[PDB]
UniProtKB/Swiss-Prot annotation, chain A:
Belongs to the T4likevirus baseplate wedge protein gp7 family. It comes from Enterobacteria phage T4. It is found in: Virion. This is Baseplate wedge protein gp7. Heterotrimer with gp6; assembles as a (gp6)2-gp7 heterotrimeric molecule. The (gp6)2-gp7 heterotrimeric molecule further interacts with gp25 and gp53. The gp25-(gp6)2-gp7 module is involved in sheath contraction. Interacts with gp8. Binds to gp10 homotrimer; disulfide-linked. Heteromultimer with gp10; a gp10 molecule is disulfide-linked to gp7 and the other two remaining gp10 molecules form a disulfide bond. Intermediate/inner baseplate protein. The gp25-(gp6)2-gp7 module is involved in sheath contraction. Involved in the tail assembly. The lineage of its organism: Viruses, Duplodnaviria, Heunggongvirae, Uroviricota, Caudoviricetes.
UniProtKB/Swiss-Prot annotation, chain B:
GO terms for molecular function: identical protein binding. It comes from the Viruses. One of its GO terms (biological process) is viral tail assembly. One of its GO terms (cellular component) is virus tail, baseplate. This is Baseplate wedge protein gp6. Baseplate protein that is located next to the tail tube (inner baseplate). Involved in the tail assembly. The gp25-(gp6)2-gp7 module is involved in sheath contraction. It comes from Enterobacteria phage T4 (Bacteriophage T4). The keyword Nucleotide-binding does not apply. Keywords: Viral baseplate protein, Viral release from host cell, Viral tail assembly, Viral tail protein, Virion. Its main location: virion.
From Swiss-Prot, chain C:
Disulfide bonds join 136-147. Induction: Expressed in the late phase of the viral replicative cycle. It comes from Enterobacteria phage T4 (Bacteriophage T4). This is Baseplate wedge protein gp8. Homodimer. Interacts with gp7. Part of the baseplate macromolecular complex which consists of gp5, gp5.4, gp27 (central spike complex); gp6, gp25, gp53 (inner baseplate); gp7, gp8 (intermediate baseplate); gp9, gp10, gp11, gp12 (peripheral); gp48 and gp54 (proximal region of the tail tube).
Length: 49, 658, 328
């Protein structure tokens, strides 16, 4: 008693961004690069258009 | 709208564990009669067969006989469920708050007395008794005694007034040898624990507890009270480590509880039993005990006049279970030292609880450092300035240091009423006049029953119910209210103005007539000089104006009284109400203005430039008629019933009928 | 007590910043991708069903991964694309080729069965409205409209006649008749399609890259009314980026040599600094496409994402490819 007081109000917000973020899945690939600079020799043929 | 709910609040207003609740016997049996049934031992036996029935019927009788024992104890067991009052105090006493016995009618006097001896200093020793007739009755005075020693400087001219304050009763002192095993009873009724002071051998000890309690006295000096269930008070003090504990400030330490006694510390106590609550308003005093060489030449009532005051004070019932019951919880809540506003409410309620029916603790946000208090002298509306000062300082004991207590009686709405009440002559053999003396009690009854409690909306009619209820030989009852406030300055409205909180009829805003000194001269044969002329005026509201406003019309003015200014003109409107004067003076000015919807009312006499002092009286009473049935209160503005001090506010017409 | 949400767009938004954030040289991120740990998980590691131990994140875990690291590869922003899961109209193999759900996104022209129209790149339609008869996700409701008025999902009974067509705003095969209605988005030009598209995930164009050609992406046609717009990715709400990278033996022959048991685990790193002979020398961010882990400063740059696999064995003259998809 005997005192007033003055009141300012505030607010905060608590939010998860990251839980949604993840890495889904990772994949890779196997390739045969045609550079020239080769002989055939092993095997033959095989895949034929 | 109103209150939607999700499963809200809790368990009604207050706990009733309600397994305890006493039920109706038949149901009790009805419950129990089932109980014996289903009992594995017999599923056969028919209870409605009257033979077993009355047999089981009996079990419930005891079971009910025994239950109210078990149940009531619980009500008892739990404060605020406690039905016994001497219960209530116990837990309250336990909570660190006690209700007190009727508290002596108290007052102050200054008295001018010549010492026959002409010594520099006489004392008035504590214990000189004075007599006061109760108000209007001289058949017996009420004795009352000097509270304490006081001395007075002899003034020159040899006459000098001491002053001293006075509580009612007789000093009654009793020495007792203290002993280890024994109660210490005072069987005295009319005792009050507040005027109880004592002496161990020599020095005074204080029950810590609302006498001083903060001083260097180290707490070794102390004692307690308690209420014997009988109604008489027994003494108590702490035994062994009477101070907090152990070594504390002494280097030798060891143990001291005091009061061995063997015979040590023969306890002599001194107190006043009192007739109080009957003695309030005792004006005429006597100097009822002589002393050596002192002679009172005059005892003059009430130094530092209120000016509105009555004789003595105090007394008290003592007891009320309702005001007491919840209350100590706050003191159970608060510590000794008072901190919270309502803590200042309840704390004040302790001492001068019999002085104060209701006390309003609040801050005024304007002035910090001040504890603003609105209380009910409960004998009247105005605590005499010494009381105010009194409890203040005493209150001020418990308080935050920079804080100051500030006590003011708030403004008071006054209900000004003429009453029209009919009765059948024949129907009553009883003296007609005394009937009025009857109702005039039952009027405040409603107030005390209601209005001062919450200071909520006020119901005229509902008031008129109980006065209707009075004789039942009263045939009918009628009344009409005029809402009335009092004004401190006629001259300038309080800054904020004044508001009714309550809708009034337009043009129904009135005030009191009062003279005004006018510079113009009067002389009459044999009268001679005769100062000048003075006539009377009053405060008048004009009609409602659009936007619910009105301008305050001054009372009528004679010509040449008010210097006419190009700005200020005689209002000279058609509407505004006018008193009828022999002057026929038609000069009326707007001194200020109002609006009816806001109920806020302002004027300034600086407006009309008329001098404050050419008015005789500083305060004027305010008249108004609220258009609404019931009176609404908000803050510090409370309707209340004081007829005795202000009868003109309360009038009753009596209609005899055959 | 309040309730609040983030729009799905913000998923997209994170990406766009993040997409913006890969820098070239200065003051914007640079990304390296690293492989390592010749070392065997355990003798089993090779066997079927083998799952490497769940990775650990720590300055310790870092060090070890930083220890074994075989090789490192940069990433150019042009190898980063927004993508959404590909679904083609009419594809028999996968269920309900002909049954589309509201707001589903349909690619057209991708395949002969798909293809309505020759001489145009892939199309991307979204399906606004679905046949009235169908099934509700909430078993309680037999009406599409009521299912949806409440918001439960609805599965339509009737299949689409044809994959949608026309550049215009909702088409939808609305007039003549159909249960499906169709909204047009943009057309994908062929070159980007073939090279970017994984049959599960079409590649979605960047707004900047969009700023360049609205036409090559077929977006020039529409209506924005904001003037340039181009914020199209908001409309598709792609939350998923595809990292594409290229490993080659040549940069790292040593790990390529015959008989390597291969690298167990993968790690990406952002903004590493070059090796310096003298530590007082000023730091240098890493331009070149590959760095031996040596040519990189110890612990330099940050590795966001750590990975552990059963062993994969690289071989010289083999060419290995990595794709990674972040869902923000």
């Amino acid at each position: 008693v005997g005192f007033g007081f003055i009141a300012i109000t505030l607010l905060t917000m608590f939010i998860n961004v990251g839980l949604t973020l993840k890495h889904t899945e990772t994949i890779i690939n196997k390739y045969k690069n045609y550079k020239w600079d080769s002989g055939l020799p092993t095997e033959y043929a095989d895949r034929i258009a | 709208a109103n209150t939607p709910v999700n499963y809200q609040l809790t368990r009604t207003a207050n706990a009733i564990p309600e397994i305890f609740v006493g039920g109706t016997f038949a149901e009790i049996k009805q419950n129990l009669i089932e109980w014996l049934n289903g009992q594995n031992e017999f599923l056969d036996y028919d209870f409605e067969g009257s033979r077993l029935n009355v047999l089981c019927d009996l079990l419930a009788y005891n079971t009910l006989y025994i239950q109210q024992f078990g149940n009531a104890a619980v009500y008892e067991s739990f404060m605020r469920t406690a039905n016994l009052r001497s219960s209530v105090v116990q837990a309250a006493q336990d909570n660190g708050y006690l209700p007190t016995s009727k508290s002596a009618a108290q007052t102050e006097i200054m008295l001018t007395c010549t010492d026959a001896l002409n010594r520099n200093y006489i004392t008035i020793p504590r214990g000189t008794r004075f007599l006061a007739y109760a108000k209007d009755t001289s058949v017996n005075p009420y004795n009352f005694v000097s509270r304490e020693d006081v001395i007075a400087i002899r003034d020159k001219n040899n006459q000098y007034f001491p002053r001293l304050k006075l509580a009612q009763g007789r000093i009654v002192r009793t020495e007792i040898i203290y002993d280890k095993l024994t109660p210490i009873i005072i069987y005295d009724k009319n005792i009050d624990r507040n005027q109880v002071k004592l002496y161990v051998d020599g020095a005074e000890w204080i029950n810590w507890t609302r006498k001083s309690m903060v001083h260097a006295g180290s707490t070794s000096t102390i004692y307690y009270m308690r209420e014997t269930i009988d109604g008489n008070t027994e003494f108590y003090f702490g035994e062994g480590e009477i101070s907090v504990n152990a070594s504390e400030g002494a280097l030798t330490a060891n143990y001291i509880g005091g009061l061995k006694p063997t015979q040590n510390s023969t306890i002599v106590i001194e107190y006043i039993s009192t007739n109080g609550a009957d003695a309030n308003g005792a004006v005429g005093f006597s100097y009822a005990d002589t002393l050596t060489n002192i002679t009172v030449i005059n005892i003059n009532e009430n130094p530092n006049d209120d000016p509105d005051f009555v004789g003595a004070d105090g007394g008290g019932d003592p007891e009320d279970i309702e005001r007491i019951r919840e209350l100590g919880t706050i003191k159970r809540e608060t510590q000794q030292r008072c901190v919270t506003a309502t803590d200042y409410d309840t704390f004040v309620s302790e001492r001068f609880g019999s002085i104060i029916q209701a006390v309003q603790t609040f801050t005024d946000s304007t002035k910090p450092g001040y504890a603003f208090i609105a209380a009910k002298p409960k004998s009247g509306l105005y605590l005499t300035t010494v009381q105010r000062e009194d409890i203040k300082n005493y209150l001020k004991d418990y308080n935050l240091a920079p804080i100051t207590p500030s006590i003011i009686s708030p403004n008071y709405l006054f209900i000004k009423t003429n009453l029209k009440v009919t009765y059948a002559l024949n129907k009553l053999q009883e003296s007609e006049q005394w009937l009025e003396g009857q109702i005039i009690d039952k009027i405040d009854r409603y107030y005390t029953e209601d209005v001062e409690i919450f200071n909520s909306s006020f119901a005229k009619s509902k008031m008129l119910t109980y006065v209707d209820d009075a004789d039942h030989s009263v045939i009918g009852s009628s009344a009409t209210i005029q809402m009335v406030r009092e004004v401190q300055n006629f001259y300038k409205t309080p800054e904020a103005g004044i508001k009714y909180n309550n809708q009034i009829k337009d043009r129904s805003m009135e005030s009191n007539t009062f003279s005004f000194n006018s510079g113009r001269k009067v002389v009459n044969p044999d009268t001679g000089l005769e100062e000048d002329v003075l006539y009377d005026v009053r405060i008048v509201s004009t009609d409602r104006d659009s936007k619910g406003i009105g301008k305050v019309i001054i009372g009528p003015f004679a010509s040449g009284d008010v210097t006419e200014n190009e700005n200020i003109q005689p209002y000279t409107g058609n509407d505004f109400n006018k008193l009828a004067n022999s002057d026929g003076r038609d000069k009326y000015y707007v001194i200020g203005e109002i609006n009816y919807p806001a109920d806020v009312i302002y004027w300034n006499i600086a407006k009309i430039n008329l001098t404050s002092e050419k008015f005789e009286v500083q305060t004027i009473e305010l008249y108004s008629d609220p258009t609404d049935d019931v009176i609404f209160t908000r803050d510090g503005s409370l309707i209340v019933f004081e007829n005795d001090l202000r009868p003109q506010y309360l009038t009753i017409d009596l209609e005899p009928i055959s | 007590i309040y309730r609040a949400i983030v729009t799905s767009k913000f998923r997209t938004e994170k990406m766009l910043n993040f997409y913006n954030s890969i820098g070239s040289g200065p003051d914007k991120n640079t990304i390296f991708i690293t492989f390592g740990r010749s070392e065997p998980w355990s003798s089993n590691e090779n066997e079927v069903g083998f799952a490497p131990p769940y990775p650990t994140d720590s300055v310790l875990g870092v060090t070890d991964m930083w220890t074994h690291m075989m090789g490192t590869v940069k990433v150019l922003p042009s190898m980063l694309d927004a993508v959404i899961p590909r679904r083609d109209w009419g594809d028999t193999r996968y269920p309900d080729p002909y049954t589309f759900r509201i707001n589903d996104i349909v690619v057209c022209n991708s395949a002969p069965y798909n293809a309505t129209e020759s001489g145009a790149g892939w199309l991307v339609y979204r399906c606004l409205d679905v046949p009235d008869t169908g099934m509700c996700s909430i078993a309680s409701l037999t009406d599409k409209d009521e299912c949806l008025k409440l918001g439960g999902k609805w599965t339509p009974s009737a299949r689409s006649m044809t994959p949608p067509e026309g550049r215009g705003d909702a088409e939808g095969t609305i007039e003549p008749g159909d249960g499906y209605v169709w909204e047009y988005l943009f057309e994908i030009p062929p070159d980007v399609s073939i090279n970017r598209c994984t049959n599960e995930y079409i590649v979605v164009p960047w707004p900047e890259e969009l700023k360049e050609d609205p036409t090559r992406w077929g977006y020039e046609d529409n209506l924005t009314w904001q003037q340039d717009d181009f914020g199209l990715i908001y409309r598709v709400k792609a939350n998923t980026i595809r990292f594409k990278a290229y490993l080659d033996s040549v940069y790292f022959p040593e790990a390529a040599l015959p008989g390597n048991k291969g690298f167990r685990q993968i790690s990406i790193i952002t903004n590493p600094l070059e090796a310096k002979a003298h530590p007082n020398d000023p730091n240098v961010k890493a331009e070149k496409d590959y760095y031996d882990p040596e040519d990189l400063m110890r612990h330099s740059g940050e590795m966001i994402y750590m990975e552990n696999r059963p062993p994969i064995i690289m071989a010289m003259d083999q060419t290995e490819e990595i794709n990674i998809l972040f869902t923000f």
